[PDB]
């Protein structure tokens, strides 16, 4: 039993960024292996992966993640 | 039993970015293997992967992820 | 039983980006292998993968993902 | 079992950044192995991974993560 | 079992950064191994990993993380 | 004066190479620039640029090179 | 006066290489610039640039190189 | 007076290499600059630049190099 | 003057290398600069730059190098 | 003046190397600068720059190098 559930019910300044780069190299979420079995990646939020990365008011309601890896069980 | 469920019921400034690059190299979500078995990737949110990446008010309601890999079980 | 379900009922400034690049290389969601068995990728949200990427008000209601790989069971 | 649940019900200045780089190299969340079994990554929050990385008002309600790895159980 | 629950019910100056860098190398969360079994990473908050990294009002409500790794039971 | 001269006068085993590659990338003589004025390249001998390169008894008599660049005068 | 001269007169074993590679990247002679004026390259001998490179009895007579760059005068 | 001269007159076992690699990256003679004026490269001998490089009896007679750079006069 | 000269006249066991590598990175002769004026490289001998490099009986007669950089006068 | 000269006239066992390496990084001759004027490199001998480097009977006759940097006058 792997169960997730989400409910979201409702009875409903200045941000300046200035950048100047030369030869940038960026890696975000990485996963490197040799001789593995499972590679599982779940995203319920935000991944902002620029050279200039700006996130405003991003992750704001009712997230749910359920995972179950492995489980030989015999 | 792998179950997900989502419900969303509702009785219903300035952001400046200025950039200047030369030879940018960007990677985002990556998954590298040799001799693996499963590669599972679930996205319920946002992946913003520019050289300039801006996200405003993005992930805002009722997400659900359920995953189950492996399970030899016999 | 691999079940998803989603419901959404409703009883109903300035963003500036200025960019200047020379020879940028961008990747996004990636999955590389040699000698694998399963490669599963599910998107329920958003993947914005420009050189300049802007995402405003994107993922805003009632998503659900249910996944089940592997499961030898014999 | 592996259960997650999230509920969200509601009865509803200046930020300056100026950067100037030359040959920056950035890694965010990384995971390297040789001869592992499981590589699991769950994101319910935010990952901001720039050369200039700005997050404002980002992670603000009702998140839940549940994970279960291994479990030989026989 | 592995349960995680979250609820969030409700009856609802100037910050200057100036940088000037040359040859910067940044790493964030990292996990390097060889001959392991599990590599689990759960993110419920924020990970800001710039050369200049700014976070404001970022992690502000109702998170929950549950995990279970191992459990040989034999 | 840019003068060259070359004279040649004459009054008259086992080699084994076994290779096995996968994904090779080779560069030989290169020259990369941005905003040059002169890019001069002279070859009087041998340039052998294989994935597997074998040279045997190649450059064996009377070579000459004379080069004169620049001279803003 | 850039002068080169060469003269050559003549009044007249097992070698084993075994290689096995994967993911090979080779650079030989390289010259990289940004905002230069002169890039001069002369070869009178041998440039052998394999992944597996073998040279046997290669450079064996009468070589001359004469170069003269610059001279803003 | 940049002069080079060369003369050459004549009155006329086992070698084993065994290699096994994975992920090889080789650079030979390299030159890297930013905002230079002259980049001069003369080869009179041998440049052997493999992942496995073998040179046997290679550079064996009468070489000459002459070079003159700069000279703002 | 920048003068070179070379003359060469003649009135006329077992070697074993066994290698095994993983993730090899080799540089040889290198030159790196920023905001230079002259970069000169002369090779009159041998440059052997492998991951497995073997040179046998290589540099064996009558070499000469001359060089003159600068000279603002 | 910058002169060189070379003459070479003539009136005419077992070696075993075994290597085992993993994650190996080798450098050789290097010259790294920022805001220099001249960078000169002459080779009249041998530069053997492997992960496994072997040089047998290599440098054996009549070399000469001359160099003159500077002379502001």
From Swiss-Prot, chains F, G, H, I, J:
The keyword Acetylation applies. It comes from the Eukaryota. Phosphorylated, predominantly on serine residues. Phosphorylation by CK1 appears to occur on residues distinct from the residue phosphorylated by other kinases. Hallmark lesions of neurodegenerative synucleinopathies contain alpha-synuclein that is modified by nitration of tyrosine residues and possibly by dityrosine cross-linking to generated stable oligomers. Highly expressed in presynaptic terminals in the central nervous system. Expressed principally in brain. One of its GO terms (biological process) is negative regulation of mitochondrial electron transport, NADH to ubiquinone. Cu cation binds at residue 27. Residues 7-44 are annotated as: 4 X 11 AA tandem repeats of [EGS]-K-T-K-[EQ]-[GQ]-V-X(4). It is found in: Cytoplasm; Membrane; Nucleus; Synapse. Keywords: Acetylation, Alzheimer disease, Amyloid, Cell projection, Copper, Cytoplasm, Disease variant, Membrane, Metal-binding, Neurodegeneration, Nucleus, Parkinson disease, Parkinsonism, Phosphoprotein, Repeat, Secreted, Synapse, Ubl conjugation. Disulfide bonds: none annotated. The keyword Metal-binding applies. GO terms for molecular function: actin binding; alpha-tubulin binding; beta-tubulin binding; calcium ion binding; copper ion binding; cuprous ion binding; cysteine-type endopeptidase inhibitor activity; dynein complex binding. The modification Phosphoserine is found at residue 64. GO terms for cellular component: actin cytoskeleton; axon; axon terminus; cell cortex; cytoplasm; cytosol; extracellular region; extracellular space. Neuronal protein that plays several roles in synaptic activity such as regulation of synaptic vesicle trafficking and subsequent neurotransmitter release. Participates as a monomer in synaptic vesicle exocytosis by enhancing vesicle priming, fusion and dilation of exocytotic fusion pores. Mechanistically, acts by increasing local Ca(2+) release from microdomains which is essential for the enhancement of ATP-induced exocytosis. Belongs to the synuclein family. Soluble monomer. Homotetramer. A dynamic intracellular population of tetramers and monomers coexists normally and the tetramer plays an essential role in maintaining homeostasis. Interacts with UCHL1. Interacts with phospholipase D and histones. Interacts (via N-terminus) with synphilin-1/SNCAIP; this interaction promotes formation of SNCA inclusions in the cytoplasm. Interacts with CALM1. Interacts with STXBP1; this interaction controls SNCA self-replicating aggregation. Interacts with SNARE components VAMP2 and SNAP25; these interactions allows SNARE complex assembly and integrity. It is linked to Genetic alterations of SNCA resulting in aberrant polymerization into fibrils, are associated with several neurodegenerative diseases (synucleinopathies). SNCA fibrillar aggregates represent the major non A-beta component of Alzheimer disease amyloid plaque, and a major component of Lewy body inclusions. They are also found within Lewy body (LB)-like intraneuronal inclusions, glial inclusions and axonal spheroids in neurodegeneration with brain iron accumulation type 1. Parkinson disease 1, autosomal dominant: A complex neurodegenerative disorder characterized by bradykinesia, resting tremor, muscular rigidity and postural instability. Additional features are characteristic postural abnormalities, dysautonomia, dystonic cramps, and dementia. The pathology of Parkinson disease involves the loss of dopaminergic neurons in the substantia nigra and the presence of Lewy bodies (intraneuronal accumulations of aggregated proteins), in surviving neurons in various areas of the brain. This is Alpha-synuclein. The lineage of its organism: Eukaryota, Metazoa, Chordata, Craniata, Vertebrata. The chain holds residues 14 to 96 of 140 of the full protein.
């Amino acid at each position: 039993g792997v169960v997730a559930a989400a409910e979201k019910t409702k009875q409903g300044g200045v941000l300046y960024v200035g950048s100047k780069t030369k030869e940038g190299v960026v890696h975000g979420v990485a996963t490197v292996a040799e001789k593995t079995k499972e590679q599982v990646t779940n995203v319920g939020g935000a991944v902002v992966t620029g050279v200039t990365a700006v996130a405003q008011k991003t992750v704001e309601g009712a997230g749910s993640i359920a995972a179950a890896t492995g489980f030989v069980k015999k």
